Ligand binder design. Structure first.
Ligand SMILES: Nc1ncnc2c1ncn2[C@@H]1O[C@H](COP(=O)(O)OP(=O)(O)CP(=O)(O)O)[C@@H](O)[C@H]1O
Ligand SMILES: [Mg+2]
Ligand SMILES: [Mg+2]
Length: 319
């Protein structure tokens, strides 16, 4: 119980809960993938081999972006992922050959998002042949018996071409929600939480194609979250804070920019709702700090994350 001459307390690469030396994952985490999943075998490819497969398969896959990714199915009885080109059930993101600790960063950041009540798909880390960690996330547009749900990103919805990521604004993002979502006021609360979250965790890369609407449960809503990571600590010499301007600003954002201009003037949220969300963030910060300390980020990357988080929290008076 003192962890002085024995392994430090181990944490699950899916849930971050305490696990024993003989376990690689917690039962709770494995069962988020499937109630019958017994284990998750390491990927039989090194990080470099995963990146090469990503390059070879990109044109055959139904998901695309800047970073290296693979599509995969979960073989439940065999207890492993299988790489596929079509009908992916999961996306796998191997280590970058450029940026440090990208899978570990995205994994913990997506977990922080879940803890503040954002809708986040099942996600986690899986070991590789070279002991490197690869990030995985469930496809939220393929459910049940390989049934596809309709999904469109905000570039498509705002009449831009498929490459437009930055030539937009948070005000245009709001306008898309107002135009298309079934219950825009509910989605505005979600966008408020997501935008504060991205500021607190250093995600300066929440671009237009990271916003999507989905048709599910007999309504059109903002999709489950994807691609949330602390991009500031993974990059060097980052100066901007927001990918898309708010009030014409991508840097030097103020508390009133978020809590008055954005929350009240642009989103129309009632003051009691704003205060309640602020209190939610205030209460969650110690849990986030604990989770970062339990994460698979290196000690040095944890310190960068915690330092930035505390700076951003001070700017919003969330302490
Ligand atoms: N869990 C998920 N379920 C369904 N679709 C997903 C998904 N995650 C990502 N996608 C789809 O794949 C696209 C690219 O995803 P993502 O943004 O994570 O790529 P990426 O890792 O290459 C980083 P970047 O955004 O900088 O290109 C998304 O816009 C979305 O259409
Ligand atoms: Mg990005
Ligand atoms: Mg992004």
């Amino acid at each position: 119980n003192l962890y002085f001459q024995s392994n430090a307390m181990k944490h699950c690469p899916i849930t971050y809960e305490k696990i024993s030396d003989q376990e690689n994952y917690s039962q709770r985490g494995l069962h988020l993938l499937s109630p019958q999943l017994k284990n998750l075998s390491p990927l039989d490819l090194s990080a470099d081999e995963q990146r090469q497969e990503a390059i070879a398969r990109v044109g055959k896959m139904s998901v695309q972006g800047v970073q290296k990714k693979l599509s995969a199915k979960l073989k439940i009885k065999e207890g492993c992922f299988e790489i596929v080109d079509q009908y992916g059930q999961y996306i796998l993101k191997p280590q970058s050959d450029i940026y440090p600790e990208l899978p570990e960063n995205e994994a913990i950041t997506m977990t922080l998002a879940k803890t503040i009540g954002l809708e986040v798909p099942v996600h986690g880390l899986v070991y590789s042949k070279d002991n490197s960690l690869t990030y995985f996330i469930k496809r939220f547009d393929r459910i049940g018996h390989n049934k596809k749900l309709a999904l469109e990103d905000f570039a498509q919805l705002s009449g831009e071409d498929r490459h437009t990521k930055y030539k937009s604004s948070m005000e245009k993002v709001i306008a898309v929600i107002e135009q298309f979502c079934t219950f825009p006021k509910i989605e505005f609360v979600k966008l408020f939480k997501l935008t504060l979250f991205n500021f607190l965790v250093g995600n300066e890369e929440m671009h237009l194609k990271n916003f999507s609407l989905i048709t599910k449960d007999r309504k059109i809503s903002i999709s489950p979250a994807y691609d949330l990571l602390n991009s500031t600590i993974a990059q060097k010499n980052t100066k901007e804070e927001l990918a898309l301007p708010l009030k014409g600003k991508k840097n030097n954002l103020t508390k009133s920019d978020f809590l008055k201009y954005f929350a009240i003037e642009k989103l129309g949220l009632n003051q009691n709702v704003i205060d309640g969300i602020v209190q939610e963030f205030h209460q969650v910060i110690p849990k986030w700090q604990e989770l970062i300390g339990f994460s698979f980020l290196s000690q040095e990357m944890q310190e960068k994350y915690l330092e930035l988080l505390e700076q951003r929290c001070k700017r919003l008076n969330f302490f």
